[PDB]
Amino acid sequence: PYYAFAEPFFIHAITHLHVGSGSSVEEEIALPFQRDELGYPTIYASSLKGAIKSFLLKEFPDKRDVIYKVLGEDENPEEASLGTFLDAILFAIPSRIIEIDSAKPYVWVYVTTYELLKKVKLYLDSISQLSNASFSNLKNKIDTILAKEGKNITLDSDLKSAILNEDFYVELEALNNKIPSIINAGVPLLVLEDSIGREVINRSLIRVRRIRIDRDKKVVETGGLWSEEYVPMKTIFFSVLLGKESKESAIFASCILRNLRYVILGGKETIGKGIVELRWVKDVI
Amino acid sequence: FLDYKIIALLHDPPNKAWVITGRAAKYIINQLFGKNYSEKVDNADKLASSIDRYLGSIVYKERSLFENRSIFLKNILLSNIQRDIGNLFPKDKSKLDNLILEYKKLLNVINKTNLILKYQLFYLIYELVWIDSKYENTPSDTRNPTHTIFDHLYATAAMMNWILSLEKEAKGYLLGIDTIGVADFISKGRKTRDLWISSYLVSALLWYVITWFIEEYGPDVILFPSLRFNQFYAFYLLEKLRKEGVSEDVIDEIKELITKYIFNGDDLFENLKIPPYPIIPGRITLILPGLIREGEEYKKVQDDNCFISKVKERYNEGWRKLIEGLRCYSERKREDGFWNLVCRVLKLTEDLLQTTPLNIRVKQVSVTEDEIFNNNKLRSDSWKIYDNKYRQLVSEFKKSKLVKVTPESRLKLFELTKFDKLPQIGEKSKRGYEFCTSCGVLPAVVIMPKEDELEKKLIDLGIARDEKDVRSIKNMISPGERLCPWCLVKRALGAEPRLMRILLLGDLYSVEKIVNEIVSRDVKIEIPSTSDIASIKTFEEMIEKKNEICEDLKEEEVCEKPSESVLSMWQWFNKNYYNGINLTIDPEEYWFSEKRRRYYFSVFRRHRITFPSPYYALVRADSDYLGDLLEGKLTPYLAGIIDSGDYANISEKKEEVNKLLEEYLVNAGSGSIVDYVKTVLKCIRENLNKCSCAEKIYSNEVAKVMFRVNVEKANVEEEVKNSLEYFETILNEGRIIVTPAWHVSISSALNRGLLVELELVNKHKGFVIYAGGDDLLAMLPVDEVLDFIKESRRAFAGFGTEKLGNMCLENGFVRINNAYYPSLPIVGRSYSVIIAHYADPLFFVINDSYNLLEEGKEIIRYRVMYNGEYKDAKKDVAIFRYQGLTSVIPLSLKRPIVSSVSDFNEIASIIDVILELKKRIDEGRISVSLLYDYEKYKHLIVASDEKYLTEFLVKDWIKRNSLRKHVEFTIDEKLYGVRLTIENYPIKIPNDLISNIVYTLRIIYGGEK
Amino acid sequence: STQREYVFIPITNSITIDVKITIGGSDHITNIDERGIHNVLVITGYAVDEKNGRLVPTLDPCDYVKGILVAGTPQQAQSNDFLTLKLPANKLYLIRKKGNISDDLKIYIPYSSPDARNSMKTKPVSISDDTIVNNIIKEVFDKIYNITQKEKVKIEKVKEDIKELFSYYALEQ
Amino acid sequence: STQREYVFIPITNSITIDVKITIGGSDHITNIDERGIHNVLVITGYAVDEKNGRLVPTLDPCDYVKGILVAGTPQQAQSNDFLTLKLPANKLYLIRKKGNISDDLKIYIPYSSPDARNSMKTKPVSISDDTIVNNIIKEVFDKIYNITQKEKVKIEKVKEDIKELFSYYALEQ
Amino acid sequence: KRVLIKPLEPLMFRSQGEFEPLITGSHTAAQSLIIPRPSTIAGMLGYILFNKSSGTGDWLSDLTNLLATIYGTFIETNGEYLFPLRMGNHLALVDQQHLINLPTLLEKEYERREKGIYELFYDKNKLFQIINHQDRIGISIDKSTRTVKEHYLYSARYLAFKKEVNYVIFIDNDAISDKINGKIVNFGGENRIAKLEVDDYKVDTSIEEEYYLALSPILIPDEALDNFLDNISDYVAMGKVDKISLGFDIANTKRKEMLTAILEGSIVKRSIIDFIKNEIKNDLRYRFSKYEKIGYNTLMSLCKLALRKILS
């Protein structure tokens, strides 16, 4: 009854992303990314609900009736929706690392603040009662990480100190525990302090100058100059599909989502942005 | 009995600076009896000005204790500014009374039997006939020249309404009226066609109800605003005479007496036949007698509630007569179309429209025989009440401001929405009812398609009886819009804005005698659009390169004939429409379409002109700490140093405030009266606090007492005590005393500051939307905004280098052909400047122009140089906004604003540095990439601490981006220690002024595309 | 200089012997002008003791009783069980502020010891019995203000404003 | 039956020794639970009287002082000076309330004689000067809360909590 | 008794531009409400407890069958109880320590009040320590060209929470207290999500006092509007009065009603109580009993958190 079940998933950036926002200049960027309630990158619920519906209608038009009746009918706007995406939350963003006193040398690591993990816990404590995808091991690692609020936590016990994004000296402690990692690769997740993590991430965004060139003589047109912020490859967002309990939603869960791996999201796809691989949490840790 | 107050007004001669004790009541009266007193007009003189206890009560009437025959003149706010009048006076002793006879060119060709026609016709032309013989605005008191005489002459007849109301048994009143909320109503509007008249419905509905008084109590009865330079009052009085039936030659002694001063252009009150500009503010005060007219004679009723019921129904009586005459026009012209629709709803909804779309708070205080009379003459401190009644009145505004009851909330809509009793036009609501799109809250009665099958399918819903009337429906109503009944009145009023002469004249005629004038005529009126203002320099270049670039465009009605008669309220247009270029067009289809817009850019590039720039500029202003100056508080002198909330405990903030009024009032005297106040004032917590702290200055007070003997005594134990109780008030309370002459002096300068600001804006290419006078809302083109702001703040403070219509503008004054009228030098003027693309939703542009300004009045603080050290201010900022690029520029850099004559040329000279930087970038002397190379220099100049090392880092940045290596740019070094405090508010504002200099020119060149 | 003292209006006739004052000075804090009461004091945190009326200082912000200040000092039978203080004329939460304050004023207060042996839970009560104040004006409002039967032509006017304004708290013990 | 007692917390250094029954029993009203100081009593009409700091009772509800509540009676050298009282935990209103109180307990508040010598130049004081927090935490925040440094370790937060919450009013002299 | 509402994401409550004391560079077509109406709340709980056999034409007749009396709306950030406060086109979120000394401040003189409110709304407000007004601008895309579709753009201005913030209401029932506890609900406007949970919580009610606070829109019977406005300061001390809409019925898909209301956060006096209870008649007497049962006339004293209705 009324969101009787839900499925969490992760949003991986296979290429860069640009999911544009209210395109103003308050950060000397002409096309800033969609900001969150704290300044982090996020994906709005409409940009997921639209661009996954717009993908599936182009892929499975035999299922056009179901995708309409779950994700929102537009020719008949009377009827309600039964599927609802949350706002995607920045779970991890990769960052360049230079090792100091490590046994395994790395080149890049994932970075998170505790602020970003408080919202992940805020999701997971709220979808726990649906009893269908509990995965308490996932949020219990979040419990142990948020137990150390105020330090700088790594999850591979070899690092002990590093320079992140070539400008930020950090000093790590491990969990004094193994704590098997949430993410997919063999790459350390370095949960940072809430102060410095709004710099290491904010350095790890990609700010690109672009121009528009007159094809006739290879010189820039007047006014063709603007800045864009991309979100890098391998960035991991987190969001949960919430579904109500009609049987047209379970067929939508059955052979739609389980045939769904790569999704185009966001804008500027002719530049080749917004190719996104989705990893559900019902087949992983 | 009243309306004989001319002798109460002219209780003194207007040659008062050549009469009081030296420098040769010289004349009294030549068209009535001697002035009405047994003690009546004399006490009306002694309660009118603050000089009456500055130097004591009887020295105001003994007229020689510290006399002078070398005559200067001062400003009322700031007496560090000496003004000279010298040897010149209006002329020879045998032609001294020709100007008395030039009163009598109309006022004794018409019979003096009635007094409701004299007292109103004498008030308006009173200064205007005297200034043309050049008397140089002499002071009232020679010992203290800090009041112009008309501001004491118009005061001593204004508060004569209190004197002649205390002569039945006891009555008398103040009555202040404020509207509920201006700017949210003003913001409602979709075309600027609503925005202009919504400013007008504020003023004209408030103009209606104040004709009810002056046709029954005469003028000089509203202090605030003054009816001396009201542009509404030069159209209302212009049709009182035109109703009478005199020749139009005879009125040229009146009309072109008005014309060269008020309404300076050729667009007059009788060129377009209305006032152009809504001028009355939302906040007004009346000083009122206790009388009720029954025909030539007045009775009183004692109950206080005689006004606040019967004023507000006159405010209803306007809105009734506004909409019922508006029923007539769409009934008279019902076959024309778009008015078939407006006549249809006014036949439907006559339940909802009997309430006004704006309301007013009318607060009322009174006066009795107590506190003004003791046996039948004055008591001790009879002047302590008048400010306190103003403090009674404003406290009533201070109390009832905290509840704003919105004007939508007065309707009864429950049964109309519980049960479907809503009348509608067009589609029927699938959702019960549909929200209005131009107020935003109300239900709609117009439901219109956006498209689908546009012109065809609108007919079968009941909006069209043919095809050709849709073009008038599509004219003022864009498709897809849904309107409340209140905006559908306003969008009908925007089409015929001349229709409000019903409301504007107060129904001076009958209801049909007004409307039948413009039943006849069909003069089309243009309001400029947003693509008009953004493309001024399109029309400025089509004038210059006239037809040699216009041959492919001789079919596109841009170079065709200016067709009908069409002429606007906008003065740039109104003297450049007939150049060979029509300007009635809406250029969203010529060079702001996209089909034939690229082709028009194919025209401009072969002729090498500047493209249309898609950005206009909205400019709002504000008076900074106005009402507390009119309450007498010293916040606008020390704005941000001591705000109004610090008036709880002034006995710890006593440091600079007891320095402030001290050095002002001792600067207000002249000669031997200067020493008379400078030792009686200081002994308050200095000596033993009682009398004989100032008996020592009797030793030179005695040098005039046995001179021409008229004094009734040999003992002065009382004139060094009642002078002491006056400064017991204005030191132990930091307020300065509000007199009748206090409000008349400021409001006359407000009215002069009004009309000079109307001329300043269209010395540029500007347009006026709202102009209350202490408030402003105008829309300039994107170029001329900065030097406007530079010279608007220099005009509102009062400083000129440029000759206007006929007025000369001096330091702390203003001169119209001889007469130095004063100014408002210390009262700052905030600004909120939005650069806007023309395709913005304009409801919200008017939202974040008020909402930008109200947060700027509270949070924005900057370190300001006070006596060598850095104190902090809060006001006098000129906030810019490109779209989110917000920039805050202070305008003062000294507390107070002015303290000598050499200080005027540095008010808002911050943005002259901006202007001179803009002056040297567009030439190619300073490089363009100066502004972008700045953000490397900001992190050091911020972290720099003493400005000597900062001098190079500023000059390096100038030198590093310099195309020539000898061009030198002079930056003031006091622009360096300024840092901006903006706490707890989410917008991004830079914390030093040099970044805000840089971010100001990022906006302006960003405005020019 | 000047000083004042406090009187209260309970549901009890415990005001008979309070002070020996009628005017004291010549003008008053609370006024009598034809539209009800003026400059009427409200003091929170003091609850009444109906029988042998006193006011105990509680620790409650919304426990409030209203009173009136007129120039004098009680009986020369106090200074052991009352309170008194001299405030800078604006530490007073008094309804309907009309006259300009004197920048200073000395006022006494009928005080009661907390009586720290009872579980006191108060209760707010409203004034009733139009007669009760219609002759508390016989008790004090004419004793403290001779203006009764001389100025106010609308007696029931002040009766009804005393009905509507005044309501206070009681110890109920 | 249970009795409690009020400890006012200003920056003032008039706290040296007033309490001997510091724990007495085992329960005291206020507490700290890893997110700030709980049950901080506001009292209106009272102010600090800096000279050998205590609480002058004035007659302005704008005047308020915050403090804590601990079990016991102070030093048994007083009740000639303190305003000992008893309330059903209902008329005193604190912040951060966690458990339903026992519906009746007594109170010991330091009280000051009114003694109107000059006008009480009331001022607001917000807690500043981290060093004063550092010496008062050793002073009282531990002599009562022996729990501290056993259960509570987020010490900088109970510093972070009082500097902007704990405020009081003063007499300037 | 107490039901916490935890928003999992930013919320939207479609206000129609009633209040706007704020700048971003926004120009947004839908301004949001800071504290929602109770018809949202009662409509959300009745969206849980709905049955097909409880479908009839009149909504509030059906809605009060589905539940008990719902009480007012405010904020608990785990450590505060923040309460609305309106000065007129302004809003604040304050704890009650700045409400206790508030009816002190109301009756005071000229400059004491401007000393009071301008520290209160401007230095003692916890709005912008909590609320991040977040513009969101959405579009529509034709599936056959992949561009913007013409004419379809909106700019909805949502309501985000900087730190964790929960809504607080009170309900008198105990049977529903389990089945409402722990429910993910479609709370709010454009398909946003919140979480309900139920804790039993003692609350004192029904204190008689002059100056109250309105924790919900006090409705006005829309018959004595002249009798109400003529002494406006007789019933409200400070606050804002506006014609509100009661919202949107689900089963019949129309707007509900429009009434003048005393907006929440307004400081009223006791004289509104006998005013409503002597300007009602048997139709609206039976109507407005239901409106308090869904929670409009919630009145809180500034002494302590004690609630009461008008007809209660």
Ligand SMILES: [Zn+2]
């Ligand atoms: Zn409308």
